[PDB]
Coordinates of C-alpha atoms in Angstrom, one line a residue:
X2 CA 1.2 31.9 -58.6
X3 CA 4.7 30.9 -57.6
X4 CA 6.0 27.3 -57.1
X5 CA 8.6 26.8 -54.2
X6 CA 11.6 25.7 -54.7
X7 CA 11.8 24.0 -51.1
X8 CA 8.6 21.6 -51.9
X9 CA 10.2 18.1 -50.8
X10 CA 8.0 15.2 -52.1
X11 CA 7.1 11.8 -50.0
X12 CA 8.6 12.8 -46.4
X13 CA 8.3 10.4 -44.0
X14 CA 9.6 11.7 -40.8
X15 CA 8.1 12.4 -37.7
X16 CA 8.0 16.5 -37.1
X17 CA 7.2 16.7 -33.4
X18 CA 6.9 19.8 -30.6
X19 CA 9.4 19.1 -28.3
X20 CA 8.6 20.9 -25.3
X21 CA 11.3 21.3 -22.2
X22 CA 10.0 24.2 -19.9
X23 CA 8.5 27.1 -21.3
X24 CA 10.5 26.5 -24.5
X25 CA 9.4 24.6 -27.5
X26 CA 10.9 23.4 -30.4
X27 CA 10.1 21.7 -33.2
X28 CA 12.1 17.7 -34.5
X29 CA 12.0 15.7 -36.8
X30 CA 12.5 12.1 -36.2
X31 CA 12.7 8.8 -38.1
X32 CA 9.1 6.8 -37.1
X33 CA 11.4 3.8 -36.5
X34 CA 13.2 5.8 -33.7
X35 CA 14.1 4.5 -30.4
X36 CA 12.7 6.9 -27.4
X37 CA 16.5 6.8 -26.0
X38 CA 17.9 7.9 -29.3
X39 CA 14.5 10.6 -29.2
X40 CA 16.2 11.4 -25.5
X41 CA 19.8 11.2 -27.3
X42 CA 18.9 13.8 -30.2
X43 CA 17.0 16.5 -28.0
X44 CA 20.2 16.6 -25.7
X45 CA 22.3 17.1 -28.7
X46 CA 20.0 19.9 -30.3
X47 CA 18.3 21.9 -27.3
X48 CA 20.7 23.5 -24.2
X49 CA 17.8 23.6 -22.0
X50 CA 17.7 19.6 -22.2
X51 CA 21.0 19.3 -20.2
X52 CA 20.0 20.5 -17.0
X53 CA 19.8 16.8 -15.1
X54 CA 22.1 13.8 -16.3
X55 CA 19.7 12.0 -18.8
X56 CA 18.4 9.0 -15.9
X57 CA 16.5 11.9 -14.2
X58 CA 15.0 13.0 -17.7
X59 CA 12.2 11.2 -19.7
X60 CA 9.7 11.9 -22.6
X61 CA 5.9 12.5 -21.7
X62 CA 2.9 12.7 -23.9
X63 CA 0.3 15.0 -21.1
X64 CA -3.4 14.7 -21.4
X65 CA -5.9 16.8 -20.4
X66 CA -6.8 14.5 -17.9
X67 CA -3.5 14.4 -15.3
X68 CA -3.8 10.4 -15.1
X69 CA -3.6 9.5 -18.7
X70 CA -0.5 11.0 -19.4
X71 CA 2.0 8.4 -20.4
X72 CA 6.4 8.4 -20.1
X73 CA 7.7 6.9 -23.1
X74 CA 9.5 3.5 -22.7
X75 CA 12.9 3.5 -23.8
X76 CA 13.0 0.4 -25.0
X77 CA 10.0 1.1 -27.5
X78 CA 10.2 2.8 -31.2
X79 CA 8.5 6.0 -31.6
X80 CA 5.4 5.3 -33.9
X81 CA 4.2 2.8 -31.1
X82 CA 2.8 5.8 -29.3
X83 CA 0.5 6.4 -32.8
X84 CA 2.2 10.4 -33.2
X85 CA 1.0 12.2 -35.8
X86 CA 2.6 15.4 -37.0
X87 CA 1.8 18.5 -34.8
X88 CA 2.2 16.6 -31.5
X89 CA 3.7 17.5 -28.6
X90 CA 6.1 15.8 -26.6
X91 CA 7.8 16.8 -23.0
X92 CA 11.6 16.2 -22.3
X93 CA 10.2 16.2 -18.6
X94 CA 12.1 15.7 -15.3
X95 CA 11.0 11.8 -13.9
X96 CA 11.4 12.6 -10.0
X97 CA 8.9 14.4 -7.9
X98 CA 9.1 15.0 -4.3
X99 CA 6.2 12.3 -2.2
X100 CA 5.1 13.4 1.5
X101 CA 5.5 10.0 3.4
X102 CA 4.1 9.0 6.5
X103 CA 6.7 6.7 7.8
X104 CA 6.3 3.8 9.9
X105 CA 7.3 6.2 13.3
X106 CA 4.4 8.1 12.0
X107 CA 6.6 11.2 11.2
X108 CA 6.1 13.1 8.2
X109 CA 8.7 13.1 5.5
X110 CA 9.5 14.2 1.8
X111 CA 11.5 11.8 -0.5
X112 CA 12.1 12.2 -4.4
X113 CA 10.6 9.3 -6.5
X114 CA 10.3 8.4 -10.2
X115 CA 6.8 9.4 -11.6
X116 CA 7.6 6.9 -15.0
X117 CA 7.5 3.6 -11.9
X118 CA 4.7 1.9 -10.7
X119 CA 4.2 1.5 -6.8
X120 CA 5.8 -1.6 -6.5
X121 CA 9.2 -0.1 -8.2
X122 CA 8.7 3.1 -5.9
X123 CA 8.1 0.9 -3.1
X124 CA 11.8 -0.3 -3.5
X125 CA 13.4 3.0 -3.6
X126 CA 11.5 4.2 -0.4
X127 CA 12.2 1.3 1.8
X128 CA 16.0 1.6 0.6
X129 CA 16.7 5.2 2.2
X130 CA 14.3 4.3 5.4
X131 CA 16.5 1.4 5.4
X132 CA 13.4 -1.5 5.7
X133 CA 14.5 -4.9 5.2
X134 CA 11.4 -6.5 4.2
X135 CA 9.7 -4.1 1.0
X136 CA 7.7 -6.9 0.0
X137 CA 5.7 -6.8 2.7
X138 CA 4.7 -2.5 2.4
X139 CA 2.6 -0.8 0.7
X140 CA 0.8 2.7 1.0
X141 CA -2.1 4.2 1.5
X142 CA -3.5 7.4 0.9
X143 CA -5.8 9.8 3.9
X150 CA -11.2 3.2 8.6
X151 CA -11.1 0.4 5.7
X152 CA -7.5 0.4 4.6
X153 CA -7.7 2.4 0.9
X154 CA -4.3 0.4 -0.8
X155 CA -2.8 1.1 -3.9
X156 CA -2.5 -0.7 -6.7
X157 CA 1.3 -2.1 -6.6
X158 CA 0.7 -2.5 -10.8
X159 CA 0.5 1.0 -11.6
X160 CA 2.2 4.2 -11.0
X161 CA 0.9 7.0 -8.6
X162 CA -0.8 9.1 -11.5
X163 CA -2.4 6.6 -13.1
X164 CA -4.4 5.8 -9.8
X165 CA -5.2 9.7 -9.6
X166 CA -2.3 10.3 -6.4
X167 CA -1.7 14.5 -6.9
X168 CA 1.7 15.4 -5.7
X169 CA 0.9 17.4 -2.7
X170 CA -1.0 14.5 -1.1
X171 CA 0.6 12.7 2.0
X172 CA 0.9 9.2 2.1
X173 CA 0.8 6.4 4.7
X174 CA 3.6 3.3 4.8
X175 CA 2.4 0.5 6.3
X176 CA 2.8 -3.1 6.4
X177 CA 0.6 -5.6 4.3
X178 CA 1.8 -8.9 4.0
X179 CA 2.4 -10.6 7.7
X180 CA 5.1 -13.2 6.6
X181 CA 8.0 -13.5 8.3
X182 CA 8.3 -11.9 12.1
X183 CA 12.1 -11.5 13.3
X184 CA 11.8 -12.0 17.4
X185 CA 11.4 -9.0 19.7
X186 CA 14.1 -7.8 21.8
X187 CA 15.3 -4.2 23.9
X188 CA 18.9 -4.4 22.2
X189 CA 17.0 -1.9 19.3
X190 CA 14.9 0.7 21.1
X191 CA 14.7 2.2 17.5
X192 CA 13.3 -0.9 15.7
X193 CA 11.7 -1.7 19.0
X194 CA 9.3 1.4 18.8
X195 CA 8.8 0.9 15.0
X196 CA 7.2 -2.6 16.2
X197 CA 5.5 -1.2 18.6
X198 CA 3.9 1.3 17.1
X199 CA 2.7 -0.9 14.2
X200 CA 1.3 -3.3 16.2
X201 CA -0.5 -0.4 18.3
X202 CA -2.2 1.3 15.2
X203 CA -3.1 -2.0 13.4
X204 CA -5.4 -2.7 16.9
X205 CA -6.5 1.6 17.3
X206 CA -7.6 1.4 13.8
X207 CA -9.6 -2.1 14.0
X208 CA -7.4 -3.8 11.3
X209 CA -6.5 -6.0 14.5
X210 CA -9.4 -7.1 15.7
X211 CA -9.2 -7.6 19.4
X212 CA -11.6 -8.1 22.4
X213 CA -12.9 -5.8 25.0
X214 CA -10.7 -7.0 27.6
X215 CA -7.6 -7.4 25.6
X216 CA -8.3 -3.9 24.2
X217 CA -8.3 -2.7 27.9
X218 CA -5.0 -4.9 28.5
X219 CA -3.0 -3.0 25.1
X220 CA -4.3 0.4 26.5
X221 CA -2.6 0.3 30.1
X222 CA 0.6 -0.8 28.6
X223 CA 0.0 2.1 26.2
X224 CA -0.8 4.4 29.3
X225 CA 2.6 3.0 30.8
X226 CA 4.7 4.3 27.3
X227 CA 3.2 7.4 27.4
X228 CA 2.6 8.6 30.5
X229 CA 4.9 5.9 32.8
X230 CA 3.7 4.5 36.0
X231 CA 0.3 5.3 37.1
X232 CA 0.0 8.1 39.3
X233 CA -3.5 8.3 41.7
X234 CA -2.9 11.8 42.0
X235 CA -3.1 12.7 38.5
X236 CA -4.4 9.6 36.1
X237 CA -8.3 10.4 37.6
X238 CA -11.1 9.8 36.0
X239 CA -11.8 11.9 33.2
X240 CA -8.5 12.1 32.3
X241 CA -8.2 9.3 28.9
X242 CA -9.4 10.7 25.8
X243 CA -10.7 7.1 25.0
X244 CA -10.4 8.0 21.4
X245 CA -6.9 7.5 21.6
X246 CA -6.9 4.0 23.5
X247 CA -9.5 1.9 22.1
X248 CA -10.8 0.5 18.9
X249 CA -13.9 3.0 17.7
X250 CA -16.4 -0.1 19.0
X251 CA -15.2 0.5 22.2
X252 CA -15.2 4.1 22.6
X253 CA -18.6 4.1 23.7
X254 CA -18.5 1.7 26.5
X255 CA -17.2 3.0 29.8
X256 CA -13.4 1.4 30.1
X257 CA -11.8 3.8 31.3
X258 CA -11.8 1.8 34.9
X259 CA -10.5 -1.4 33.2
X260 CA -7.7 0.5 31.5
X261 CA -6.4 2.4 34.8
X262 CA -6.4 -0.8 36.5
X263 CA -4.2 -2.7 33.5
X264 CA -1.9 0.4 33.7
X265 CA -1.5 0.0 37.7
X266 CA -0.6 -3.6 36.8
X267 CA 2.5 -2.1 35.3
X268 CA 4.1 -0.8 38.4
X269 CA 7.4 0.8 37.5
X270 CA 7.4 -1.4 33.9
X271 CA 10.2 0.4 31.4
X272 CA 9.1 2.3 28.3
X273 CA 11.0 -0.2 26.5
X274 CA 9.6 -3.2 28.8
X275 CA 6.2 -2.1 28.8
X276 CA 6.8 -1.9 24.4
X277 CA 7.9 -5.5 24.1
X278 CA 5.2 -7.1 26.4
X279 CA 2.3 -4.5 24.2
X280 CA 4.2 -6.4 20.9
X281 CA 4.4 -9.9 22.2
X282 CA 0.8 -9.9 23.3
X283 CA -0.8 -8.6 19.9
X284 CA 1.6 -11.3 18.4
X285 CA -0.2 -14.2 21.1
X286 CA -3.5 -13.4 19.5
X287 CA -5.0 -15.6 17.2
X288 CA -5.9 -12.4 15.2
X289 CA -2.9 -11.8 14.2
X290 CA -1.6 -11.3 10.8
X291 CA -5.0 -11.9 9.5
X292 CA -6.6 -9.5 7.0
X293 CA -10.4 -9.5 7.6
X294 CA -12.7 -8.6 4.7
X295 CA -16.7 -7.7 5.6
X296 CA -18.7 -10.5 3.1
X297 CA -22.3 -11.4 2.7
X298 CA -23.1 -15.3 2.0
X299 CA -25.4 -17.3 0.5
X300 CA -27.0 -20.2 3.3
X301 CA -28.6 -22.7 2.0
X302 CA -32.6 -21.7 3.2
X303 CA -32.0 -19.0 4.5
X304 CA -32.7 -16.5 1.2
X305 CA -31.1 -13.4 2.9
X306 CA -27.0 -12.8 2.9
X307 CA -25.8 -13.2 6.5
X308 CA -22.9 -11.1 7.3
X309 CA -19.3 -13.2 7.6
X310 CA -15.4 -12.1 7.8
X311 CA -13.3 -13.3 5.4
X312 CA -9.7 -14.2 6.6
X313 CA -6.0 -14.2 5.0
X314 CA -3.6 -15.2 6.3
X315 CA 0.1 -16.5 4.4
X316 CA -1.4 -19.7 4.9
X317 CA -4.6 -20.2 4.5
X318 CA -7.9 -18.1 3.6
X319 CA -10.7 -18.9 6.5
X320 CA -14.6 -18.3 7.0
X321 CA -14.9 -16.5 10.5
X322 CA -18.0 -15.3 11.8
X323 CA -18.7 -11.9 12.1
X324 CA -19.0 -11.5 16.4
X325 CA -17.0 -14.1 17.9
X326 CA -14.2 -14.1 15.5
X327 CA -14.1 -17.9 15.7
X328 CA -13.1 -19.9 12.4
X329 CA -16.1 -21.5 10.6
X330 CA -13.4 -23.2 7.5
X331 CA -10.2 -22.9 6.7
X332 CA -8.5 -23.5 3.2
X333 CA -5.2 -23.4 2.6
X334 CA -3.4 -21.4 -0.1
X335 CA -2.4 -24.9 -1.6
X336 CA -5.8 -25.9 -2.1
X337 CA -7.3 -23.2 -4.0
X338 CA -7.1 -24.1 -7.5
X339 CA -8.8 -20.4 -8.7
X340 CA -9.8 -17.4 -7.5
X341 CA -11.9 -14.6 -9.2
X342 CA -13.0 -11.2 -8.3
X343 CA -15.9 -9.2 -9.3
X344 CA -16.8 -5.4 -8.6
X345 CA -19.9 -7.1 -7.0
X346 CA -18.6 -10.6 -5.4
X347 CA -15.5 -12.4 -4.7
X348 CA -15.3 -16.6 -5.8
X349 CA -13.1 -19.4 -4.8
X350 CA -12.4 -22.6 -7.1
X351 CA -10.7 -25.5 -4.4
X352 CA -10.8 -27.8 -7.6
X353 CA -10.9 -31.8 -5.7
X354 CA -10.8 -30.6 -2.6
X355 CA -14.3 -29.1 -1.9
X356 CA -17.5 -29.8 -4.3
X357 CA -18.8 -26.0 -5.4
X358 CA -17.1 -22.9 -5.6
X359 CA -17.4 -20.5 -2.7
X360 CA -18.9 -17.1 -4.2
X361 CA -19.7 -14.1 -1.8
X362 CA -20.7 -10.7 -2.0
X363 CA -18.4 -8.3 -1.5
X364 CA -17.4 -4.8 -2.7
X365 CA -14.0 -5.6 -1.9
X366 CA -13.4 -8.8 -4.5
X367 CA -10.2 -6.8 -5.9
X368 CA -8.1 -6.0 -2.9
X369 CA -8.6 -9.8 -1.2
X370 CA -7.7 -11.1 -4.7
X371 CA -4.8 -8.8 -4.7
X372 CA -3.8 -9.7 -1.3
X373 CA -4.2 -13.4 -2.1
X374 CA -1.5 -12.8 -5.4
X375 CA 0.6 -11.1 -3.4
X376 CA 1.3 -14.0 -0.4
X377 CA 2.1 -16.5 -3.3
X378 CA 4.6 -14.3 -5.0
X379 CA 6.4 -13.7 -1.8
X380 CA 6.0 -17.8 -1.5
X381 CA 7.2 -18.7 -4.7
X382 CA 10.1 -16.1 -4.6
X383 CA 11.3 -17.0 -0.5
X384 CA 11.3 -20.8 -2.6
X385 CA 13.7 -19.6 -5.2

């Protein structure tokens, strides 16, 4: 038996794997620690630490399960993450490159901070597409409009990196006017407007869908042409809401594009804009529910309307308002993986509860026009 001579009682450090790459190294580090002097010390000890200034650089614990890995706030002492000796930790490059969808529908790649949630990203994204109004975006990934949560980063809702996402707008609550002096903001309007009524997130009528279609006919093909725009010739698909698709309006759509006569592109754009605007659908968010009548012992049906003014009751067809609240007199709201509930406090006796499986995104839609309220008040 032999005693060591380099047997050091009651150490308290922190002796960590620092990882950076394929190389690996192990610290030691004071529990009390700050992550940026963590950040500071592995720059000052490891070469392979100084390839990116130290903004681009952060430390990650990984997990075997991609969405539970966690970057290390700066702000925060190291034995709030609960190391123990042995553990690994990443000096890991923050940006990532995200496949965007912009508004023009074009597809493009832009670097983004993996440590920021959504709402943070969201910032940085509308900045280089140079978007005014980022409170009113969010995305989507690749129907019923899958959002993301603006509270949490892209890996912690389960985004991989080589999935494309979709920009779009969310909150409808401020609308500059519509002229031709920008064809370039012009189109990005237009097309907005366009998909929001394609996809059904714009609920129109028959006849107005008709209308919207021969102006669309007019952008993309220009004036109508007898010789050439037969019948046959639509892929319907590609000019009406789905619940139209199967009716036969190809007729109605030729005659709304003849309408047009020698219209502009760009004329034929602001007139498809300003009539989506006219519509008393507009900038409404619809949400599928199921009520309780009183009697009746079966859930009827009903669309559930926001607006950033008022929530309504609409009925399910005729897209007529049943009720209207507005934001100011709703004194709660709550939501439910099964149902969605509305406390109006003096203004209405009983709550209104409904079935939903959608209780979490109107909720979320409902937080988000007040914020945008309380901060256009500051």
């Amino acid at each position: 038996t032999a005693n060591n001579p380099l047997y050091k009682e009651a150490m308290v450090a922190l002796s960590l794997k620092i990882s950076i790459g394929n190389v690996v190294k192990t610290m030691q580090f004071e529990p009390s620690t700050m992550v940026y002097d963590a950040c500071r010390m592995i720059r000052e000890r490891i070469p392979e630490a100084l390839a990116g200034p130290p903004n681009d650089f952060g430390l990650f614990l990984s997990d075997d399960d991609p969405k539970k890995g966690i970057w290390l706030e700066a702000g925060k002492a190291l034995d709030y993450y609960m190391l123990r000796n042995g553990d690994t930790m990443e000096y890991r490059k923050k940006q990532r490159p995200l496949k965007i969808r912009m508004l023009d529908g074009t597809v493009k790649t832009i670097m983004v901070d993996d440590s920021k949630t959504v709402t943070d990203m969201l910032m940085t994204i509308c900045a280089r597409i140079g978007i005014t109004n980022h409170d009113e975006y969010s995305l989507v990934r690749e129907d019923e409009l899958n959002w993301l949560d603006h509270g949490r980063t892209l890996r912690e809702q389960g985004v991989e990196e080589h999935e494309t996402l979709l920009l779009r707008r969310k909150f409808f609550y401020s609308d500059q006017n519509v002229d031709s002096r920008d064809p370039v903001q012009l189109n990005l309007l237009y097309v907005q407007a366009r998909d929001d009524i394609l996809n059904g997130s714009h609920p129109v009528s028959f006849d107005k869908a008709c209308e919207f279609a021969g102006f669309q006919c007019q952008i993309q093909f220009g004036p109508h042409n007898e010789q050439k725009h037969k019948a046959g010739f639509l892929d319907l698909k590609d000019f009406l809401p789905k619940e139209y698709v199967k009716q036969k309006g190809e007729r109605k759509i030729f005659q709304a594009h003849k309408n047009c006569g020698q219209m502009s592109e760009i004329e034929a754009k602001v007139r498809y804009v300003k009539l989506a605007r006219s519509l008393k659908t507009y900038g409404v968010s619809f949400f599928l529910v199921k009520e309780k009548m009183k009697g009746k012992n079966k859930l009827v049906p009903r669309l559930l309307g926001i607006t950033k003014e008022c929530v309504m009751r609409v009925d399910e067809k005729t897209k007529e308002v049943i009720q209207e609240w507005s934001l100011t007199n709703i004194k709660r709201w709550a939501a439910s993986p099964k149902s969605f509930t509305l406390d109006f406090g003096d203004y209405q006796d009983g709550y209104y509860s409904v079935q939903t499986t959608e209780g979490e995104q109107i909720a979320q839609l409902i937080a988000g026009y007040i914020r945008i309220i309380l901060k256009k008040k500051k």
